Design a protein around this nucleic acid. Structure first.
Length: 50
RNA sequence: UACCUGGUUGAUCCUGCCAGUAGCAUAUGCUUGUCUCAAAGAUUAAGCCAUGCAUGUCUAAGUACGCACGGCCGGUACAGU
């Protein structure tokens, strides 16, 4: 399942500005950038053996 | 700049020390217009200390749900300060 969309949201209300909602940055999500760092980590091992 | 002078006797020649003469660095007295440098609670007590200051620190790159401030609307991890 997708871990996004199920994340809890916090509503903001005050007399001045419009309503808003907040949610946190997620800390173990395995995005494409995490996978890209894992690929270079093993490309450096191959280069040293050559 | 490798230098001496007064003082023992009625007078002389010596020994020998006292006093004078020049510099240096601590205190102290009288006196003082301009201008460039600049030592300064060591000496006695490593004695006793009111008050203030004398050591802090963030980048594109460890952790941002602070309505704290904010956008054109939306969290697509999640904007931005």
């Amino acid at each position: 399942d997708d871990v996004r969309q199920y994340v809890v949201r916090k509503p903001l209300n005050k007399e001045g500005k419009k309503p808003r909602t907040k949610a946190p940055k997620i800390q173990r999500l395995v995005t494409p950038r995490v996978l890209q760092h894992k690929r270079r980590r093993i490309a450096l091992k191959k280069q040293r053996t050559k």
